[PDB]
Design an enzyme around this catalytic site. Structure first.
Site, PDB file in Angstrom:
ATOM      1  N   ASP A 223      -2.397  12.721   5.413  1.00  0.00           N
ATOM      2  CA  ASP A 223      -0.950  12.683   5.207  1.00  0.00           C
ATOM      3  C   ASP A 223      -0.157  12.829   6.509  1.00  0.00           C
ATOM      4  OD1 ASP A 223      -1.582  12.446   2.502  1.00  0.00           O
ATOM      5  OD2 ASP A 223      -0.994  14.496   1.984  1.00  0.00           O
TER       6      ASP A 223
ATOM      7  N   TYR B 202       0.752  -1.241   0.000  1.00  0.00           N
ATOM      8  CA  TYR B 202       0.000   0.000   0.000  1.00  0.00           C
ATOM      9  C   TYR B 202       0.787   1.298   0.000  1.00  0.00           C
ATOM     10  CZ  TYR B 202      -4.179  -2.754   0.309  1.00  0.00           C
ATOM     11  OH  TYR B 202      -5.190  -3.630  -0.011  1.00  0.00           O
TER      12      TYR B 202
ATOM     13  N   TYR C  22      -2.977  21.533  -0.097  1.00  0.00           N
ATOM     14  CA  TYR C  22      -3.537  22.014   1.155  1.00  0.00           C
ATOM     15  C   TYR C  22      -2.526  22.946   1.818  1.00  0.00           C
ATOM     16  CZ  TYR C  22      -0.798  17.848   2.404  1.00  0.00           C
ATOM     17  OH  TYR C  22       0.202  16.915   2.483  1.00  0.00           O
TER      18      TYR C  22
ATOM     19  N   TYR D  85      -7.823   8.499   2.205  1.00  0.00           N
ATOM     20  CA  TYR D  85      -8.046   9.200   0.943  1.00  0.00           C
ATOM     21  C   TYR D  85      -9.409   8.817   0.378  1.00  0.00           C
ATOM     22  CZ  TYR D  85      -3.383  11.232   0.017  1.00  0.00           C
ATOM     23  OH  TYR D  85      -2.223  11.976   0.017  1.00  0.00           O
TER      24      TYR D  85
ATOM     25  N   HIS E  14      -3.766   5.093   5.327  1.00  0.00           N
ATOM     26  CA  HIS E  14      -3.651   6.320   4.541  1.00  0.00           C
ATOM     27  C   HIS E  14      -4.530   6.229   3.294  1.00  0.00           C
ATOM     28  CE1 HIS E  14      -1.566   8.953   1.525  1.00  0.00           C
ATOM     29  NE2 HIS E  14      -1.586   9.785   2.549  1.00  0.00           N
ATOM     30  N   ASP E  15      -4.443   5.096   2.607  1.00  0.00           N
ATOM     31  CA  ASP E  15      -5.228   4.840   1.404  1.00  0.00           C
ATOM     32  C   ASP E  15      -6.719   4.883   1.760  1.00  0.00           C
ATOM     33  OD1 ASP E  15      -5.124   3.925  -1.483  1.00  0.00           O
ATOM     34  OD2 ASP E  15      -6.293   2.267  -0.642  1.00  0.00           O
TER      35      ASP E  15
ATOM     36  N   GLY F  98      -3.075   3.837  -3.984  1.00  0.00           N
ATOM     37  CA  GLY F  98      -3.889   2.870  -4.693  1.00  0.00           C
ATOM     38  C   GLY F  98      -3.295   1.477  -4.633  1.00  0.00           C
ATOM     39  N   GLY F  99      -3.167   0.947  -3.421  1.00  0.00           N
ATOM     40  CA  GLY F  99      -2.624  -0.386  -3.251  1.00  0.00           C
ATOM     41  C   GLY F  99      -3.723  -1.431  -3.302  1.00  0.00           C
TER      42      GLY F  99
ATOM     43  N   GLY G 121       2.410   4.057  -1.327  1.00  0.00           N
ATOM     44  CA  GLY G 121       2.430   4.658  -2.635  1.00  0.00           C
ATOM     45  C   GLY G 121       1.032   5.226  -2.649  1.00  0.00           C
TER      46      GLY G 121
END
Lengths: 122, 122
Positions: free
Chosen positions: A89, A27, A64, A51, A47-48, A31-32, A29
């Site tokens: 983030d 994951y 941001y 998002y 984190h993914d 879009g894992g 990066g």
């Protein structure tokens, strides 16, 4: 934006941080898929998933507002949606920090093939 | 601690802050039930969920390290768990500031009975 995510990582984890964390496990990066490899990868999984919760703006390319101070990062601005990207983030960055002790180069630039299985549900 | 959360609110929103915000909607208190009344109440809903993700320490009672300066709030400290609490708190107070335009005394000291409906999950 990911451009800011990279800067944030470099500030919190050091200059070699971006290379160290933007390609790790299944994951780290963006879009894992599949199952998280270890704790650090779990940070990227969360984190993914974070998002995925952002719907009023684009967490990948929208910029941001944030600040750097004493090794940490602080989210600023007044746009609710952008503040939410920044928070995704910021949490991921401190998570990398809290799990530094188990980071394994075995999962560095791991390769998608090993992640091609049903993804863990957020 | 909620004591410090209170200090943040008054510093950013004014001396009347705690009295106008910690008793608003269905979630600005803690252990909220029901549906968020509006944007401001939504800030507290997220605040609750943020508190829910804190593991290892008490978001309600434990004290953290922070500072009130130049109209902003900065979190610090040496303990990752306590810093997480502080982050939940600072994000919630600036969220209040962002939505001051929709604040409505109708939800000020809303009755708990008005919040007696199926609760929104985090």
């Amino acid at each position: 934006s990911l451009w800011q995510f990279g800067k944030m990582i470099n500030y919190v984890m050091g200059e070699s941080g971006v290379l160290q964390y933007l390609s790790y496990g299944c994951y780290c990066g963006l879009g894992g898929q599949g199952q998280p490899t270890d704790a650090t990868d779990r940070c990227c999984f969360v984190h993914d998933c974070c998002y995925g919760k952002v719907t009023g703006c684009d967490p990948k390319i929208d910029s941001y507002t944030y600040s750097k101070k004493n090794g940490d990062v602080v989210c600023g601005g007044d746009d609710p949606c952008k503040k939410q990207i920044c928070e995704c983030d910021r949490v991921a960055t401190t998570c990398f920090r809290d799990n530094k002790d188990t980071y394994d180069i075995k999962y560095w630039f791991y390769g998608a093939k090993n992640c091609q299985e049903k993804s863990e549900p957020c």
